[PDB]
Amino acid sequence: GKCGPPPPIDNGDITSFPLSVYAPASSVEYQCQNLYQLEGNKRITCRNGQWSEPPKCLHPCVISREIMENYNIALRWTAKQKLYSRTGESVEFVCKRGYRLSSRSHTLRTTCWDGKLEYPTCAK
Amino acid sequence: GKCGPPPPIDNGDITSFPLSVYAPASSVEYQCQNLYQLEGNKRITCRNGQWSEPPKCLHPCVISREIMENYNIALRWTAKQKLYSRTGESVEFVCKRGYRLSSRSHTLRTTCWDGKLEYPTCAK
Amino acid sequence: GKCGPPPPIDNGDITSFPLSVYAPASSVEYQCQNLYQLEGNKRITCRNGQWSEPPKCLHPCVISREIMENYNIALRWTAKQKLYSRTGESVEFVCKRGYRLSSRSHTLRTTCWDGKLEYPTCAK
Amino acid sequence: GKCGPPPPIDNGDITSFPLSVYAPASSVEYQCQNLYQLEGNKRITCRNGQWSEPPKCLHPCVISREIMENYNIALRWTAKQKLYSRTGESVEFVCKRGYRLSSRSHTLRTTCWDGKLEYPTCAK
């Protein structure tokens, strides 16, 4: 029931030096890269010749200039610009001068989820 | 023709602090994480409101204990174990004691390509 | 009592995108790079215009070929080579063929502490 | 003249998986972490039982809110805030409203060098 070296995961790394073989019941742990959020259990364990399932590193969201221009919005806090937001973090927008929240628009405050921000839309 | 913040790529990072806006003709550069190999041009450039296409970070290959056991092979160089190999790096195997390269088998020396190693197979 | 951007630390990174200003009572967190061990509290907090003290990323230890050759020792577990060990992890050595632990020698099992391994010594 | 595993350096990493032994004439390469600038030759080579000297990862500079407040300056470009600057990158300041560059002051444009920014000073 020994295991080989643990699997790489995107945007994360194991916290220890990889070995060529691991005894059953051995474990290793992952950490996601800085702006990535680790989803699930960080620890994998060797049992019956296989590692358990690694966690996922959930993607940050990047602000889009073109979407913001198109939707007539700007970041609310010019001194606190979350150009990259972690999964679970919120970004707050405002309508640009001379615009108002459209009907059916998402709230001006919106949450990053694995790369995706649902942007609000303002109308003149 | 200004651009917003540059896009994240898997397993790589930009080498400078991201800005909220970039003038046309501005550029930034990526670096892949250690065992990843950067494919293409590391530099992206802002033109006509869009960034050019970022490079790709090609995946390393991890040795599989179960595949090696199944194919009756071992690493040749026990003092030089490439448990993780970069894209473009080769790994050399040997047949286990009492086995020989099978017909149609890949060569004992084999090259990592973006996560995939084509393993040789030995028969008793 | 607002704070500016949080301080860089060696071999670690903050887990969120840095902002130009932070309100009092704001906090950010650090993570150390993979084989580094974070000593202390990962969180810093902004109070009275200053950040609290960041943690330290304690160094891994690298095995020395020259010291091992000089002290007539080898790693015990040739399939489980901790070429780099985390702070707090132990490395186990053996005497080479035809040698014995010297008097006053450190134990064959020894612990990495912030870059330093105290190696055992064997005599013919 | 064989070498052991290559040495860790602060804020950088080798680009290949470390091996337990290296033949003379072998080489490995370092990369610095994103906002660090690699000074010198990235490649180390094994000769006569020793690795050659690794490069240095030169530190980025972080803007100080307290120094800026004390010197009556602000960043010039509020849409292009280099909160962290690479070694060799310049940061441009302006005097705050109702102040002028002091005599003997450093230029408003100033260059980051391994963590240190020489800030300009303005007087009322």
Side-chain angles (χ1 to χ4, degrees), chain A residues 1-42 44-96 98-99 101-103 105-109 111-123, chain B residues 1-42 44-96 98-99 101-103 105-109 111-123, chain C residues 1-42 44-96 98-99 101-103 105-109 111-123, chain D residues 1-42 44-96 98-99 101-103 105-109 111-123:
Chain A
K2 291 177 191 176
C3 295
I9 69 184
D10 289 332
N11 300 305
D13 281 339
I14 68 166
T15 64
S16 56
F17 192 66
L19 309 176
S20 76
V21 64
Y22 294 77
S26 289
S27 62
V28 299
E29 287 186 348
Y30 295 86
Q31 51 176 252
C32 293
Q33 286 152 27
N34 69 127
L35 299 189
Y36 289 78
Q37 171 61 50
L38 186 151
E39 176 196 68
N41 187 337
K42 68 188 171 197
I44 64 168
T45 302
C46 173
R47 293 202 279 260
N48 296 335
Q50 307 290 330
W51 288 109
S52 65
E53 187 69 11
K56 292 188 163 289
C57 296
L58 301 179
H59 291 80
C61 300
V62 62
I63 292 306
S64 171
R65 175 188 180 79
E66 69 161 17
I67 295 175
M68 293 173 73
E69 301 283 328
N70 191 62
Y71 289 181
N72 308 298
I73 56 182
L75 288 176
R76 184 168 179 177
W77 308 113
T78 77
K80 292 175 191 183
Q81 302 204 29
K82 295 192 193 177
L83 301 181
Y84 304 79
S85 56
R86 292 171 64 80
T87 289
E89 294 191 322
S90 66
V91 178
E92 191 163 0
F93 299 92
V94 286
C95 298
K96 285 181 188 205
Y99 293 83
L101 267 179
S102 81
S103 74
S105 175
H106 193 105
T107 309
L108 284 171
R109 183 168 173 282
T111 301
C112 178
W113 200 272
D114 192 24
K116 176 52 158 145
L117 271 171
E118 182 188 331
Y119 290 80
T121 300
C122 304
Chain B
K2 291 177 191 176
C3 295
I9 69 184
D10 289 332
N11 300 305
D13 281 339
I14 68 166
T15 64
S16 56
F17 192 66
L19 309 176
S20 76
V21 64
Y22 294 77
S26 289
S27 62
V28 299
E29 287 186 348
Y30 295 86
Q31 51 176 252
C32 293
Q33 286 152 27
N34 69 127
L35 299 189
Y36 289 78
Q37 171 61 50
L38 186 151
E39 176 196 68
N41 187 337
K42 68 188 171 197
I44 64 168
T45 302
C46 173
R47 293 202 279 260
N48 296 335
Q50 307 290 330
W51 288 109
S52 65
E53 187 69 11
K56 292 188 163 289
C57 296
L58 301 179
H59 291 80
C61 300
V62 62
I63 292 306
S64 171
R65 175 188 180 79
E66 69 161 17
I67 295 175
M68 293 173 73
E69 301 283 328
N70 191 62
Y71 289 181
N72 308 298
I73 56 182
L75 288 176
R76 184 168 179 177
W77 308 113
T78 77
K80 292 175 191 183
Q81 302 204 29
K82 295 192 193 177
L83 301 181
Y84 304 79
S85 56
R86 292 171 64 80
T87 289
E89 294 191 322
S90 66
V91 178
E92 191 163 0
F93 299 92
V94 286
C95 298
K96 285 181 188 205
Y99 293 83
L101 267 179
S102 81
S103 74
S105 175
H106 193 105
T107 309
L108 284 171
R109 183 168 173 282
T111 301
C112 178
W113 200 272
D114 192 24
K116 176 52 158 145
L117 271 171
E118 182 188 331
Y119 290 80
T121 300
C122 304
Chain C
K2 291 177 191 176
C3 295
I9 69 184
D10 289 332
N11 300 305
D13 281 339
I14 68 166
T15 64
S16 56
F17 192 66
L19 309 176
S20 76
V21 64
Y22 294 77
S26 289
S27 62
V28 299
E29 287 186 348
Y30 295 86
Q31 51 176 252
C32 293
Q33 286 152 27
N34 69 127
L35 299 189
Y36 289 78
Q37 171 61 50
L38 186 151
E39 176 196 68
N41 187 337
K42 68 188 171 197
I44 64 168
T45 302
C46 173
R47 293 202 279 260
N48 296 335
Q50 307 290 330
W51 288 109
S52 65
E53 187 69 11
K56 292 188 163 289
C57 296
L58 301 179
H59 291 80
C61 300
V62 62
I63 292 306
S64 171
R65 175 188 180 79
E66 69 161 17
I67 295 175
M68 293 173 73
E69 301 283 328
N70 191 62
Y71 289 181
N72 308 298
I73 56 182
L75 288 176
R76 184 168 179 177
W77 308 113
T78 77
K80 292 175 191 183
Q81 302 204 29
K82 295 192 193 177
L83 301 181
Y84 304 79
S85 56
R86 292 171 64 80
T87 289
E89 294 191 322
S90 66
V91 178
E92 191 163 0
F93 299 92
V94 286
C95 298
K96 285 181 188 205
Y99 293 83
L101 267 179
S102 81
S103 74
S105 175
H106 193 105
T107 309
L108 284 171
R109 183 168 173 282
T111 301
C112 178
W113 200 272
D114 192 24
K116 176 52 158 145
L117 271 171
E118 182 188 331
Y119 290 80
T121 300
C122 304
Chain D
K2 291 177 191 176
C3 295
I9 69 184
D10 289 332
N11 300 305
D13 281 339
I14 68 166
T15 64
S16 56
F17 192 66
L19 309 176
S20 76
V21 64
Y22 294 77
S26 289
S27 62
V28 299
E29 287 186 348
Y30 295 86
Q31 51 176 252
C32 293
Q33 286 152 27
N34 69 127
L35 299 189
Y36 289 78
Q37 171 61 50
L38 186 151
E39 176 196 68
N41 187 337
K42 68 188 171 197
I44 64 168
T45 302
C46 173
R47 293 202 279 260
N48 296 335
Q50 307 290 330
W51 288 109
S52 65
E53 187 69 11
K56 292 188 163 289
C57 296
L58 301 179
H59 291 80
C61 300
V62 62
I63 292 306
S64 171
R65 175 188 180 79
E66 69 161 17
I67 295 175
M68 293 173 73
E69 301 283 328
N70 191 62
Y71 289 181
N72 308 298
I73 56 182
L75 288 176
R76 184 168 179 177
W77 308 113
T78 77
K80 292 175 191 183
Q81 302 204 29
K82 295 192 193 177
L83 301 181
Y84 304 79
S85 56
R86 292 171 64 80
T87 289
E89 294 191 322
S90 66
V91 178
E92 191 163 0
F93 299 92
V94 286
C95 298
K96 285 181 188 205
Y99 293 83
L101 267 179
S102 81
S103 74
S105 175
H106 193 105
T107 309
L108 284 171
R109 183 168 173 282
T111 301
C112 178
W113 200 272
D114 192 24
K116 176 52 158 145
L117 271 171
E118 182 188 331
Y119 290 80
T121 300
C122 304

